[PDB]
Amino acid sequence: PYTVVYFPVRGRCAALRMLLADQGQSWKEEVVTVETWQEGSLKASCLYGQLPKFQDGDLTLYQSNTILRHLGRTLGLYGKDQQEAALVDMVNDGVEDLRCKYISLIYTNYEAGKDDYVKALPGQLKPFETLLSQNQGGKTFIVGDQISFADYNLLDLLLIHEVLAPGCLDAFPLLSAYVGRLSARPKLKAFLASPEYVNLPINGNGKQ
């Protein structure tokens, strides 16, 4: 089965969890406390000395995007052809780029860098609105007419940014509608309202 090993936060596991829940997959959560991590044995055993760690049968993986791509690949959420698969990759890489900036702000310069970050947000979000606009008027998914792992990753990015800068999507009709539409999918809606998601901090340092 599936096992996700992570700290008690949404962070880089939020998207893959949304994917698993929405896809009706069952998985086990292995919560790692700061004490256990500080112990050192687990960390030393991690390929890049970091979490998340993921297990699928006897397959052990590291790197959040590797887990997303693996789930996308094995579950059929990676486009209908090579052309779509590439576009899905293009979206996820763009999502990762912004997530990195978001993470830097959160853990590195929240107080002094928030104003500038929020000021620059529109230009960073615009590309995803454009992508939607070029795909069936933005009425379906980010790429093609079937959901992909990039959709879950983008959704999370949009959700955490609405927390960081409420109303940041107001100027973007497609992104706004997209968030509402995907968040309304039955299994996903139930997961997002559940305590295991709601009662977990977004980041490990309490900022958001």
Residues forming the site for its own copies (CB under 8 A): 47-49, 59, 61-63, 65-66, 69-70, 73-74, 82-83, 85-87, 89-90, 93-94, 97, 100, 123, 127, 130-131
What DSSP designation does 142 have? Answer: S
User: Which partner, its own copies, ligand GDN, none, binds residue 108 by CB below 5 to 8 Å per kind?
Assistant: ligand GDN
Distances (CA, A) of 93 to 7, 42, 52, 191: 24, 28, 18, 25
141: CB partners within 8 A, 6+ apart: 135, 147, 148, 151
**Residue 208 annotated in ligand binding:** no
| 29 strand-pairing partners | 4
CB of 121 to ligand GDN, least distance (A): 16
Q: Which stretch binds ligand GDN (CB under 6 A): 100-108, 118-126, 130-138, 181-189?
A: 100-108
Min dist CB 21 to its own copies, Å, is 21
Please, what is the minimum distance in Å from the beta carbon of residue 73 to its own copies? 6
Which amino acid makes up residue 117? Y
97 touches ligand GDN (CB under 6 A): yes
Helix and strand totals (H; E) in the chain: 10, 4
Q: Is 30 in the site for ligand GDN (CB under 6 A)?
A: no
Instruction: Answer yes or no: is 64 a known binding residue.
Output: yes
Is the distance from CB of 162 to CB of 121 less than 8 angstroms?
Answer: no
